[PDB]
Amino acid sequence: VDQATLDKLEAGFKKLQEASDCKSLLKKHLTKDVFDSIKNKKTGMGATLLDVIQSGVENLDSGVGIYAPDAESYRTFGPLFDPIIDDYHGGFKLTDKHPPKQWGDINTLVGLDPAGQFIISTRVRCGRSLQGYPFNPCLTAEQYKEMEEKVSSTLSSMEDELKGTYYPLTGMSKATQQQLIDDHFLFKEGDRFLQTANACRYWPTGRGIFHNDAKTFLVWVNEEDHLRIISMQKGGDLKTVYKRLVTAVDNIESKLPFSHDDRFGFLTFCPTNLGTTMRASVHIQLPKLAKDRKVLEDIASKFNLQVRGTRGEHTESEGGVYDISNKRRLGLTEYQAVREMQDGILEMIKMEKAAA
Numbered sequence: 001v002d003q004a005t006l007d008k009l010e011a012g013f014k015k016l017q018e019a020s021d022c023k024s025l026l027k028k029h030l031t032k033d034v035f036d037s038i039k040n041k042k043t044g045m046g047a048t049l050l051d052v053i054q055s056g057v058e059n060l061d062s063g064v065g066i067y068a069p070d071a072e073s074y075r076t077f078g079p080l081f082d083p084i085i086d087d088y089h090g091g092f093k094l095t096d097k098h099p100p101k102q103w104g105d106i107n108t109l110v111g112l113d114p115a116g117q118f119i120i121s122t123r124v125r126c127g128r129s130l131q132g133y134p135f136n137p138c139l140t141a142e143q144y145k146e147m148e149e150k151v152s153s154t155l156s157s158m159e160d161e162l163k164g165t166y167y168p169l170t171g172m173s174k175a176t177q178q179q180l181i182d183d184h185f186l187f188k189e190g191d192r193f194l195q196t197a198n199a200c201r202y203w204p205t206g207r208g209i210f211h212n213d214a215k216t217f218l219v220w221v222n223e224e225d226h227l228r229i230i231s232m233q234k235g236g237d238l239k240t241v242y243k244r245l246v247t248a249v250d251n252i253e254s255k256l257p258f259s260h261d262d263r264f265g266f267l268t269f270c271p272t273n274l275g276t277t278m279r280a281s282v283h284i285q286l287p288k289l290a291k292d293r294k295v296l297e298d299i300a301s302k303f304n305l306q307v308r309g310t311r312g313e314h315t316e317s318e319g320g321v322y323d324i325s326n327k328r329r330l331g332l333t334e335y336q337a338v339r340e341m342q343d344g345i346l347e348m349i350k351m352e353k354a355a356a
């Protein structure tokens with residue numbers, strides 16, 4: 001680790017201590033001891049502690065603040081990752097290992113809001129990394145193109161409900177892109193947390209979206225993760241949404257090799273996405289409970305749920321519509337993760353009906 005990198009780290013650590021109102025897990029868990037123990041370490045691809053913490057140093061409003069530039073980073077910088085992962089995912093010890101993939105009994109899932117007065121739409125996503133490719137900050141432009149080719153070629157073999165078309169971001173009209181983002185289908189462009197993590201280099205090369213005509217099945221290529229595999233539709237039919245995701249992931253898994261770790265389950269760029277990589281969410285209105293987004297968040301947290309704005313994380317609610325989802329992804333099965341959202345949303349709706 002060169003001297004220029006060390007200077008920036010010491011200055012970054014200092015900045016974090018002085019940021020009296022910073023509430024990120026990075027600040028909370030980067031103790032002087034932790035800091036000194038790993039700041040001189042480097043991975044085989046040259047990822048340093050700076051590459052890990054830089055996004056959180058520059059964006060003090062980060063909730064977490066770190067990313068893994070490569071798989072090795074998760075262990076090379078373990079003393080920082082380990083406590084943060086344990087913290088975020090609601091308990092995960094050094095000796096713990098993520099359980100084997102288990103979708104569970106899909107037939108046990110229910111409709112989340114039969115009368116249709118609270119839930120707007122339901123969505124479940126997963127993420128995957130291609131074996132042989134590092135995470136965003138270590139990728140070259142050429143690698144983005146190689147991966148885009150591989151993934152798009154694989155998805156051309158999808159059939160029936162899952163059959164669809166790949167749309168590259170390169171050459172995509174501003175109008176077409178903007179509508180897809182507005183309609184909650186395409187990942188947004190230019191995220192400051194990802195940018196400062198050097199996750200958006202060479203944009204928009206290699207980036208794009210696959211989807212069926214109904215746009216109930218989508219795959220993001222080369223945004224935050226190599227793949228995000230998405231099932232979504234209007235209404236509260238979680239069972240169908242989850243079933244479609246399972247079918248899609250099972251099919252893609254037979255064709256493309258994805259990175260899996262004995263301890264961390266499926267590997268992802270952010271530690272929040274490890275394990276099941278699963279975020280099951282609803283867009284929901286709860287006017288009585290949501291009379292203060294912090295009261296809503298406090299209610300949600302007891303159900304292990306996270307609250308986001310209408311256009312995704314780091315955004316506000318619009319027209320009272322919130323994104324509410326399972327927070328935890330690692331140290332529980334796919335089934336357990338989706339059930340936490342279902343169970344939490346069902347009770348919150350009950351609470352809403354009862355609220356004065």
Ligand SMILES: Nc1ncnc2c1ncn2[C@@H]1O[C@H](COP(=O)(O)OP(=O)(O)O)[C@@H](O)[C@H]1O
Nearest residue numbers: 121122123184279281282283310311312313323
């Ligand atoms: N239940 C949902 N129904 C409709 N759109 C959703 C739902 N949950 C998330 N989205 C959309 O997904 C997109 C990505 O948002 P983010 O908060 O970045 O989620 P992810 O885990 O998908 O990266 C945003 O446009 C957000 O509106």
Ligand SMILES: CC(=N)NCCC[C@H](N)C(=O)O
Nearest residue numbers: 062063064065066193270272
């Ligand atoms: C997309 C994603 N990984 N969100 C979780 C953390 C995001 C951001 N780096 C933060 O620390 O708030």
Ligand SMILES: [Mg+2]
Nearest residue numbers: 187224312313
């Ligand atoms: Mg995102």
